[PDB]
């Protein structure tokens, strides 16, 4: 066989530890899910520092007054949210965020509302998104890409055990923290779904073919998206692209992908099993679940526990320019925030 007795027992024991961890993680999640926290701060607890981005609300760098801590505050106009017909997505995003807990998930520290707005107060990662680092460097070497990919695999293993489908994996949504580890940030398309759902959502380059083809789909679309992400990290460009989204979709459903010649055989084989149109063969959707991915040859040198424990030396640390390095972001018109009580019942749960 491939494994002698010692290595087989080791892997067996490791996989039992995962189940035991997930059982307890589901317990902690469900309790916070059925009883979400609300109104854990107020606006006057913070000093406004810099608008960092602006539809449906803004995002500004704030500084807690009683602690000195910096946080990224998502400010959301209730009336704009009601008008964009975004009540459920807004409510559900905060409800997921306050309930989940994992090393590679951004943490919602506070949330509150006033008469005009909804506030989501996240821990502030000055590192910035993976997208900018990927475009700057060009492409990541396979060991560098593998380190990030391993973090996404564990995060999806955690989220899927909670029946959460993430649905918006892409470098734009991934931050590199000051230890060089991944933070997944945006949960606006995540959905708690046991079986199938049908919503056409995501980003064209990352859309699994069963979303494009208008059938129902399950969490296996996240494993496809992982395939896109790994390919893009190691190539510098995504596997499917064209001038217009329609031509992207045609390549996605064609069942053909081409690889740069610098891709290792192990990488190409992993990607052929992730970017697999046939759901009966897509890694992550099979009998062995996520273990087909974690045990793949491309991850042979990956110590999953050490990754989870953040004990592996990141291959890249963004330049730590202080807890308030607003010099990496574009300058925005610092528009004030006013409060006059609107949309009360729509946001009772927030």
């Amino acid at each position: 066989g491939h494994m002698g007795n010692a290595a087989a027992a080791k892997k067996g024991s490791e996989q039992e530890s995962v189940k035991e961890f997930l059982a307890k993680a589901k317990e902690e999640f469900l309790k916070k899910w059925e009883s979400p926290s609300q109104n854990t701060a107020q606006l006057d607890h913070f000093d406004r520092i810099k608008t960092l981005g602006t539809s449906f609300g803004r995002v500004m760098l704030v500084k807690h007054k009683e602690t000195g801590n910096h946080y990224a505050m998502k400010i959301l106009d209730k009336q704009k949210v009601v008008k964009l017909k975004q009540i459920e997505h807004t409510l559900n995003e905060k409800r997921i965020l306050q309930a989940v807990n994992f090393p590679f998930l951004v943490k919602l520290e506070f949330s509150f509302k006033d008469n005009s707005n909804l506030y989501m107060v996240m821990e502030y990662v000055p590192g910035g998104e993976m997208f900018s680092h990927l475009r700057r460097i060009g492409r990541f070497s396979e060991p560098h890409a593998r380190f990030y990919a391993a973090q996404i695999v564990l995060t999806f293993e955690y989220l899927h055990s909670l029946d959460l489908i993430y649905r918006d994996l892409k470098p734009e949504n991934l931050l590199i923290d000051q230890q060089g580890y991944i933070q997944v940030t945006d949960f606006g398309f995540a959905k708690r779904v046991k079986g199938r759902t049908w919503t056409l959502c995501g980003t064209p380059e990352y859309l699994a073919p069963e979303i494009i083809l208008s059938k129902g789909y399950n969490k296996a679309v996240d494993w496809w998206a992982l395939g896109v992400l790994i390919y893009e990290m190691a190539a510098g460009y995504p596997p499917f692209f064209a001038d217009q989204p329609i031509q992207i979709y045609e390549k996605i459903v064609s069942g053909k992908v081409r690889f740069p010649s610098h891709f290792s055989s192990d990488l190409k084989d992993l990607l052929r099993n992730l970017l697999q149109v046939d759901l009966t063969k897509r890694f992550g959707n099979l009998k062995n679940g996520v273990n087909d991915i974690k045990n793949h040859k491309w991850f042979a040198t990956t110590d999953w526990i050490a990754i989870y424990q953040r004990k592996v030396e990141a291959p890249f640390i963004p330049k730590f320019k202080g807890p308030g390095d607003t010099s990496n972001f574009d300058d925005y018109e610092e528009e004030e925030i006013r409060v006059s009580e609107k949309c009360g019942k729509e946001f009772t749960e927030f």
């Binding site: 475009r135 980003t203 001038d243 081409r258």
Partner: peptide, 18 residues
């Protein structure tokens, strides 16, 4: 080259959802 095609595609920037 594939890379040049990627540049010519106009989708090298941040990509919007939906």
């Amino acid at each position: 080259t594939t890379y040049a095609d990627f540049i010519a595609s106009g989708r090298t920037g941040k990509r919007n959802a939906i």
